[PDB]
């Protein structure tokens, strides 16, 4: 039932200079918070990124199966980042510890 963290929420990104999609590959029988996801960007500039509408858990929007946020970077410094903040749990009911993926951002010119 304690399958590491990372196995039960696989996270991943992919830039293409202005466009940045972050995923997640959630285990079944896991779900992530949505209001417990957090995006901080250090020496960049993104848009606002809206969350897309979950599933409900008893009075909790959650997210299943595989969670995809697009994030557009505007400008980015060399040597930039995307702190991604994230927490989720498991239908057995417990949850893990939130997490933090440091994204490395490409360098981008604004406009």
Request: glycine residues 6%; negative net charge.
């Amino acid at each position: 039932q304690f399958v590491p963290a990372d196995q039960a929420f696989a996270f991943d990104f992919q830039q293409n200079q202005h466009d940045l999609n972050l995923t997640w590959q959630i285990k079944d029988g896991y779900y992530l918070y949505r209001k417990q996801i957090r995006i901080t960007p250090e020496h960049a500039k993104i848009a606002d990124v809206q969350l897309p509408q979950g599933v409900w858990a008893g009075g909790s929007e959650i997210y299943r199966d595989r969670l995809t946020l697009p994030v557009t970077i505007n400008q980015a410094s060399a040597g930039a980042t995307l702190t991604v903040t994230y927490q989720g749990c498991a239908d057995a009911g417990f949850c893990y510890p939130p997490e933090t993926k440091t994204v490395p951002l490409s360098e981008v010119v604004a406009n």
